[PDB]
Amino acid sequence: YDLLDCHISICSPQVAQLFTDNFDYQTRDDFVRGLLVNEEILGNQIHMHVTAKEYGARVSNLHMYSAVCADVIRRWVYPLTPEANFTDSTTQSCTHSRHNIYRGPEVSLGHGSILEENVLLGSGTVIGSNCFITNSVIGPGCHIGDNVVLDQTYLWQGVRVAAGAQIHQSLLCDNAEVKERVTLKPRSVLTSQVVVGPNITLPEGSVISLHPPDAEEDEDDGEFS
Amino acid sequence: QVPTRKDYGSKVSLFSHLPQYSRQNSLTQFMSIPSSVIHPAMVRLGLQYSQGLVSGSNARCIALLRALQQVIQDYTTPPNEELSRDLVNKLKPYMSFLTQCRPLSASMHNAIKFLNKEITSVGSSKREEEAKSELRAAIDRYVQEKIVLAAQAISRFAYQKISNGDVILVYGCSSLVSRILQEAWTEGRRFRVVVVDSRPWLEGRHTLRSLVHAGVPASYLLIPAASYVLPEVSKVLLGAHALLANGSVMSRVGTAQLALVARAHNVPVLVCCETYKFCERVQTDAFVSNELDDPDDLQCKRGEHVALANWQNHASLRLLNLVYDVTPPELVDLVITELGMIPCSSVPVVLRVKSSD
Amino acid sequence: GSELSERIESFVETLKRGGGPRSSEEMARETLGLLRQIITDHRWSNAGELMELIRREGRRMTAAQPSETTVGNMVRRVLKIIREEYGRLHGYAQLQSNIIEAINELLVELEGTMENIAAQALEHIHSNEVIMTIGFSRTVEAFLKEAARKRKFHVIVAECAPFCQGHEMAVNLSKAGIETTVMTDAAIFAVMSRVNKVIIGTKTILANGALRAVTGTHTLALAAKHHSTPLIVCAPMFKLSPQFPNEEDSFHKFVAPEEVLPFTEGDILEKVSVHCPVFDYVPPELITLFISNIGGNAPSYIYRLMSELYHPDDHVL
Amino acid sequence: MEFQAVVMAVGLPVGNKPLIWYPLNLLERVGFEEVIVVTTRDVQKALCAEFKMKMKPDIVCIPDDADMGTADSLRYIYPKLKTDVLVLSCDLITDVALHEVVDLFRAYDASLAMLMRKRDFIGVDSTGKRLLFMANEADLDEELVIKGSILQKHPRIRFHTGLVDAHLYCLKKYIVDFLMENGSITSIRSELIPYLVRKQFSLKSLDIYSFIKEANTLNLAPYDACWNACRGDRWEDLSR
Amino acid sequence: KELIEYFKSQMKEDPDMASAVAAIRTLLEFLKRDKGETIQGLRANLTSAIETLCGVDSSVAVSSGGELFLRFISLASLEYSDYSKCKKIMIERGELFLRRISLSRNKIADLCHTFIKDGATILTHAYSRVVLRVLEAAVAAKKRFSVYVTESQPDLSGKKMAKALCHLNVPVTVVLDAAVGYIMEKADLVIVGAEGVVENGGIINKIGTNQMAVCAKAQNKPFYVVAESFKFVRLFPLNQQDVPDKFKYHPWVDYTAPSLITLLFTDLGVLTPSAVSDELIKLYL
């Protein structure tokens, strides 16, 4: 039970042969669950390798996304680190400070803004005064207000956070916006320029997007309908 | 009766007088299964000491006193003898067997001394089970006060010193320092703790657990990263295992080195020790009296390049794993005892208070 | 042409991914061969155009890995060689073969470095001596394994906690019979009372005499300064860098924290902050003597080797 | 005294030597100054007179009933035991050094410690000493089931198939107290193993330990292992 | 508030009188004027008295003397069971303790001035009566030496010390307070008066002391510290902020490491700095 699946299954071309034969095998665990229960027909014993000194995982939740991102920021997938810039792009290069603080170019921090643990700042993300950012990834070209807290949060590019906003364990997608006097709860998802009006606190289960039936609701300049 | 354990591996030329045993073999291969020479509780204590299951000094002394309670409860009086001489004549093979299992800590030595002073001070006018219940009551009252009340007093004296927004550095595994940090986190102080660990015990992970089950933000690193983290560290809190007559701190092996780097980074160190872990015995280095663990404990798993696997085939190869070392009294600032905040230069003087003089 | 950029990009992502190759003298030979391939596969009229070119690819190669300074100081040494030849030819067409023969002279200088340190190694070892080293370096183990040919002494190889590479040094020195003692990294001040001198290597010598090296050796330098024992830094002259310590905080190389705290620790890995710096900073006041292939030098003499091997106009690269 | 050895006889000395002599000799080698032996009455209630004809220092032979089990054998000697119980059997000739199971009983303070030597599928933790599961298809309707708490607390469990019980146990006082308080158990090899293995999967709990030896093997009640007993006693009893 | 008025009347009537002895006399007068037959009722009144004496005077010796007086009251309350005889016992014992304290400075002078060589150089800090008493006993013992006194910028009292020494007709020189490292190599001994001694052996003094102490450490000069026994404080300042901030108010108090201090000169004698912790643990706060 001590085996986290990395889904890096290296194969022989007999896998494609058995997938051509068995049309009912839809995905990987279907293939292994059909291969293990039928042994004297189509024998094909699957072998295994266990890694103890290197990292490997994938993402399928907000939980897997948050855990893998917290492992990337805490350098568990070294050499693949954001300050190394393995993708050669000038808009993604960072410098590694103490306590895993990654700082990009032209950030323009303000007075009183404290970064304590596991903070990444992209290209051109302006940060106001008296902020408190921890365990979080901030995208490039963002705008942060004043007297804010941001813990375990994932801000993507183009977002705009006003003053007094308190954001915990959430995810903000591209070009987002939030007004003042807002406080976010854990496991909140904001998706592709959803604006949240003032004096509107979201519950724990919160996914708001532009599509009505796929998300829980659709927001506007006012959060009430 | 009781033989001696064979010395394992090639000993260091500087550590030729100190014994170096192995954990894979034990002394009970040539002993009775109903233990006749040694008490069954004593051989259970020796087996749980030699295998490394009880390694903390307070836990070692507590399990030693529990085994002594089981010895006294299962003790009878022979004819033509007194209890005060037959008990000290019978406990010395038990302590010698415990020494042959593992070199004794200073808390165990002071517990042996206090038990000898207690069981020689009983009167002949008392009965058998009367004196047995008196000695059991003295033992658990003694361990009750000079563990729990001393730990509470040391934690109360440490609460008025730890500030808010502080950074505390700890090393190793100990009950007292983790209790201090737990009571300071629950009492109202907001701080983060940096844990320093060293090979091959990896016991600080234990107190790392004791920092995350209480909700304290923690940081785990090793003794090469202590030089990197000590510019950030404001205060260093350490758990002393033994305090010597010149103010020296006999403790786990990464403490005097850590105290020297902390003094080089202008960070004051704060050892935490009780009066029953003191010594009138004094030493100035880690060479005249020290514990030697197994030479087979230093090998590692870095792929499949174990270089120290067949180390005994090399005749000119020496392997050494030190347990305790000695800090000079020039490096340690605080000694937080239940009587207050004393320097190291006050360590024997409190002993003059603790000898009822 | 194109094959030049093939080899350059292969070198760049080789430095980006891992340590390729393992030891540094092969890497310096690769850097000098790549630089002679760059100067033999291009066209220029002025030396300054090749100077701007080499500055650009030096910026690229140190942007591949900022922690490893050997490629950068080799680019800077080639730049100063080009500057010296342009200065001695200015006071035109024969410049290229002059830089070729100068790079060949630097290669003959560089292949015979460790054996020159071994030739001058007998001037620092007496009989029945206690030596303590840290990490693993082929220069120091070659030093000790040939100094044991005429002397008999003791070497205490202390392992380093991120990667215990001192076990390889212990089993390589124990084959020569130098009475090797293996210890941890926490007992250094526990054994500093008996160690007579400290003979270590390094990764990069800085401009002020300071040095980055394998981690835990600043503690060893502090203990050896406390006990007033001399420090022997057996280091070649391609680990000499003009990069100052306080410069954009890009000093330490942080690696994966698996070797400190494994992934099977539990749910407590989420609320913990584990750092693993594999390098450490030693100031020049905690260093007694450097040993290079040209001889022994003081930490109060590193500025002269800096001005003799590097130019102050190329510190930004 | 720490242990009181109990030797069971439920269906005996058919071989090159007496089958009762090897366990008693093993016991009397390392300590065990007083041995409680249980006589057989299922096949014939006359072997006790054959049991009192040896030359040991001290034996305790008791009469027993015909229809009885090992749990009933421990419940029969309950008012005469005051310490830990170390159970044996007659047809068990072992060259294994006995002190490993006693070291595992003392070092971890286990509630039951047993010895096996290479049907019954057992699962033991990766340390190789503490067991977690054991089952056979004599009492299993389904194929195999594993509790979730023992997988959350112990993520890798090594299973073994060819291991046979040598019937050398180490019981504590409260185990025999619960066995006397629960009279529904008749065969202690299937009762004290499975119920304590289920109760250990609860913090404060009990510990069960096992030693898998690779030196010799035990025997059986039938004639399947009666051919190798003489070959074992011709080459293993010369040192004893 | 009659307590602060009596304290200022006792402190302003004599310029040769310290603040701590005036605070102990004020505490004894308040205990004689209390007449409350209660142990805790007297302890709370004494604690409010020391609260007033610490809110009025920001000196460390005032709170130190009040804590010693409170420990003396606790010892006298724990000794005698009945309070009626214990009140007169406290009054007589406190009067005899004040009589012993009022002769302490002369004892320091005859037991301290023996160390100063003839033809030497003295380095001294700001104004206090103790170093004047030691130096006047030294010149009464027929000794000649050159004196360098720190000007002590926040209140120019070292110049008043130099004026009091020129009226004594001794060679004294006001040296610049930024020049205590300039004249350290000529100062073969550095004797200084302190206003409070913490438990490990360090001292609480005026702000220009501790740097001079490290000038005594790098240049191997014996840094002698002179202080009485009522200045013993049951505190442990680790860093320079770890002193209580009510005694600071440009800082006014510097903590001096006990490793930088050679000797102490108290009423018990010439002591190692480890003796203060011995007296403070048999005194038990």
Swiss-Prot record, chain B:
Acts as a component of the translation initiation factor 2B (eIF2B) complex, which catalyzes the exchange of GDP for GTP on eukaryotic initiation factor 2 (eIF2) gamma subunit. Its guanine nucleotide exchange factor activity is repressed when bound to eIF2 complex phosphorylated on the alpha subunit, thereby limiting the amount of methionyl-initiator methionine tRNA available to the ribosome and consequently global translation is repressed. GO terms for molecular function: guanyl-nucleotide exchange factor activity; translation initiation factor activity; translation initiation factor binding. Keywords: Acetylation, Cytoplasm, Disease variant, Initiation factor, Leukodystrophy, Phosphoprotein, Protein biosynthesis. It is linked to Leukoencephalopathy with vanishing white matter 4: An autosomal recessive brain disease characterized by neurological features including progressive cerebellar ataxia, spasticity, and cognitive deficits. Brain imaging shows abnormal white matter that vanishes over time and is replaced by cerebrospinal fluid. Disease severity ranges from fatal infantile forms to adult forms without neurological deterioration. The disease is progressive with, in most individuals, additional episodes of rapid deterioration following febrile infections or minor head trauma. The gene is EIF2B4. Residues 5-14 are annotated as: May bind the chemical integrated stress response (ISR) inhibitor ISRIB.
Curated annotation (Swiss-Prot), chain C:
It is found in: Cytoplasm, Cytosol. It comes from the Eukaryota. Activated by the chemical integrated stress response (ISR) inhibitor ISRIB which stimulates guanine nucleotide exchange factor activity for both phosphorylated and unphosphorylated eIF2. It holds the Pfam family IF-2B. Keywords: Cytoplasm, Disease variant, Initiation factor, Leukodystrophy, Protein biosynthesis. Changing A93V: Found in a patient with Rett syndrome-like phenotype; uncertain significance. One of its GO terms (cellular component) is eukaryotic translation initiation factor 2B complex. One of its GO terms (biological process) is T cell receptor signaling pathway. GO terms for molecular function: ATP binding; GTP binding; guanyl-nucleotide exchange factor activity; translation initiation factor activity. Component of the translation initiation factor 2B (eIF2B) complex which is a heterodecamer of two sets of five different subunits: alpha, beta, gamma, delta and epsilon. Subunits alpha, beta and delta comprise a regulatory subcomplex and subunits epsilon and gamma comprise a catalytic subcomplex. Within the complex, the hexameric regulatory complex resides at the center, with the two heterodimeric catalytic subcomplexes bound on opposite sides. Belongs to the eIF-2B alpha/beta/delta subunits family. This is Translation initiation factor eIF2B subunit beta. It comes from Homo sapiens (Human).
From Swiss-Prot, chain D:
Keywords: Acetylation, Cytoplasm, Disease variant, Initiation factor, Leukodystrophy, Phosphoprotein, Protein biosynthesis. It comes from the Eukaryota. Signal peptide: none annotated. Its main location: cytoplasm. GO terms for molecular function: guanyl-nucleotide exchange factor activity; translation initiation factor activity. It is found in: Cytoplasm, Cytosol. The modification N-acetylmethionine is found at M1. The keyword Cytoplasm applies. The modification Phosphoserine is found at S205. GO terms for cellular component: cytoplasm; cytosol; eukaryotic translation initiation factor 2B complex; guanyl-nucleotide exchange factor complex. Activated by the chemical integrated stress response (ISR) inhibitor ISRIB which stimulates guanine nucleotide exchange factor activity for both phosphorylated and unphosphorylated eIF2. GO terms for biological process: cytoplasmic translational initiation; oligodendrocyte development; response to glucose; response to heat; response to peptide hormone; T cell receptor signaling pathway; translational initiation. Acts as a component of the translation initiation factor 2B (eIF2B) complex, which catalyzes the exchange of GDP for GTP on the eukaryotic initiation factor 2 (eIF2) complex gamma subunit. Its guanine nucleotide exchange factor activity is repressed when bound to eIF2 complex phosphorylated on the alpha subunit, thereby limiting the amount of methionyl-initiator methionine tRNA available to the ribosome and consequently global translation is repressed. Belongs to the eIF-2B gamma/epsilon subunits family.
UniProtKB/Swiss-Prot annotation, chain E:
Keywords: Acetylation, Cytoplasm, Disease variant, Initiation factor, Leukodystrophy, Protein biosynthesis. GO terms for molecular function: guanyl-nucleotide exchange factor activity; identical protein binding; translation initiation factor activity. Gene3D superfamilies: Translation initiation factor eif-2b, domain 2 (3.40.50.10470), Translation initiation factor eIF-2B, N-terminal domain (1.20.120.1070). One of its GO terms (cellular component) is plasma membrane. SUPFAM superfamilies: NagB/RpiA/CoA transferase-like. The modification N6-acetyllysine is found at K32. GO terms for biological process: cytoplasmic translational initiation; oligodendrocyte development; response to glucose; response to heat; response to peptide hormone; T cell receptor signaling pathway; translational initiation. It is found in: Cytoplasm, Cytosol. Activated by the chemical integrated stress response (ISR) inhibitor ISRIB which stimulates guanine nucleotide exchange factor activity for both phosphorylated and unphosphorylated eIF2. Pfam families: IF-2B. InterPro entries: eIF2B_alpha/beta/delta, elF-2B_alpha_N, IF-2B-related, IF_2B-like_C, NagB/RpiA_transferase-like. Signal peptide: none annotated. Belongs to the eIF-2B alpha/beta/delta subunits family. This is Translation initiation factor eIF2B subunit alpha.
